[PDB]
Structure of Activin receptor type-1:
Amino acid sequence: TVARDITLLECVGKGRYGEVWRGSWQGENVAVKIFSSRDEKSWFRETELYNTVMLRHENILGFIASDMTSRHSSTQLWLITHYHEMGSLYDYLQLTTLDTVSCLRIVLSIASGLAHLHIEIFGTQGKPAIAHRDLKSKNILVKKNGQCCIADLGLAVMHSQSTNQLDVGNNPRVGTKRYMAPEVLDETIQVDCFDSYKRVDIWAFGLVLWEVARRMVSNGIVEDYKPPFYDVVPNDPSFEDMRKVVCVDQQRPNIPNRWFSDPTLTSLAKLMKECWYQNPSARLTALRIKKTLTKID
Amino acid sequence: TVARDITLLECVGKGRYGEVWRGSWQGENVAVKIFSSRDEKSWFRETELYNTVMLRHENILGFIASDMTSRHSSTQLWLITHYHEMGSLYDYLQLTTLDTVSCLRIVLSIASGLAHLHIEIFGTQGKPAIAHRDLKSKNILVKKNGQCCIADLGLAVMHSQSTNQLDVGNNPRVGTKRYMAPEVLDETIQVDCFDSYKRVDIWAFGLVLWEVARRMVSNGIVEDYKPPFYDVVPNDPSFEDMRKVVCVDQQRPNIPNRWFSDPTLTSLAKLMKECWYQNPSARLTALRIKKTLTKID
Ligand SMILES: CC(=O)c1cccc(-c2cnc3ccc(NC4CCOCC4)nn23)c1
Ligand SMILES: CC(=O)c1cccc(-c2cnc3ccc(NC4CCOCC4)nn23)c1
């Protein structure tokens, strides 16, 4: 197997998600995600999607292999992918500021990845429609060309127009609380309608757009990197913390005043507000966001 | 993946277990087991054992690969193994009779496979101790050399003396009811003691020994192939059918009178009775059965 032939060179992250490593396979860099022992169902789902669907796309993390291997005399589940030295968008945004071109390249590349996930393609080229369900800056990697790619399909849900069947999987994991849409926090989400899940991804995308826009220079100024809702919830916020903020108070991230002095940031602000309607049906689609971002400059 | 490159040539079985096919990979025969959609946890467990443990042995079905693939626009889980044209011991016993040498070759090869599963080996050659939990004539394949190999590790349980930890997995499937030991049917089995599981395998092995011995010629005569307990339970017997028979009535398969006129079959009868003690602790071990079968001729 690929696992047996990989040399783990450097651990680049460790947390509740397991571990992510830079390794080498046939002397080339690869990324290796080793899952926590509580998260076999996420490994199973990504393995399923990447093996059963045609998911090659510039803005979706490129898959190499998935294996089981033995380490410390116990089973490890490995996902092996392309390695992106620039790391996560979350960490990257904290280390640099962006000009207008770099900002728009990033957010467009993300909407193009998401739109590709969200659409069903037919023919032998095809793929089912896929919703992500845990989109966030930490699940987006930055490439040397300045575009991003979307990772972590362990919560993905799929839909096929042939059978009109929705495939939700059977994973007890839930999305990152900070980025959960009100209808998830409320538990009023229509779990039988595929559109519901795409709408959850759009909310989260709105939040990511906000995170990126803060780091775009206008009039030589920027905001410091902050996570969504940083001013109203603690670190590692609870369901209840988020529900109070999002459902009861109905808060949204504040737009800095300075965005209204810049035409790109005014457009981006309008875009993010249309991702955050409390009413899931009113939110923009990923395709419409992508067309609008193709038009901003 | 191996799956994408395999040509399914002929389905050799279909049932509650999924499907088993003869296929070709790189122009050689292989077996492909496609799991039922309700049985992902068995696929996961076999994949785990065969990937994480060093399980190569003449009397254990030889593993090639495990994959996920898309067919009829849905996910299939494939186990790919060596192909054994002679098929299952269950079907084979119905199509031929055995002389003394062939009978003993079969039953010894099975006890040697089981003993290898049951023992922990240390060093870099090693493997944990493994109990099977669904041993039966249908889960044993016959090789052209007349020896058998043991298949279907989807219910396997493992133990390591290092950590003294028992790994039971998380599979809702239970063994074949007809072959369940009284302590399983009773629900008095000590689920925390590894020895309990080996003892369940020994009971089942006793039953398989009975099935094989019926087909060995002595004085030019044989019994017809019958499954264990054929005279007391229906096809597809229930837990309750089996419990009444095994726990309350305390029945055991009857030994044909003719076995007591033959010294091999008298030995084999003694061996099987020592596999069937109601008291799990009194039953022989797989290693002791193997040494005794090495001595019978
Ligand atoms: C985000 C996800 O699920 C996933 C899965 C597999 C590989 C990768 C991957 C590819 N190339 C790189 C480079 C650095 C890196 N480090 C951080 C560690 C903590 O935050 C998340 C990523 N990851 N990563 C990411
Ligand atoms: C018994 C198990 O679990 C398993 C798994 C994978 C491959 C094989 C395997 C290998 N070579 C062959 C030849 C014939 C065959 N046919 C029958 C069909 C119905 O009864 C069981 C086996 N199977 N099989 C067996």
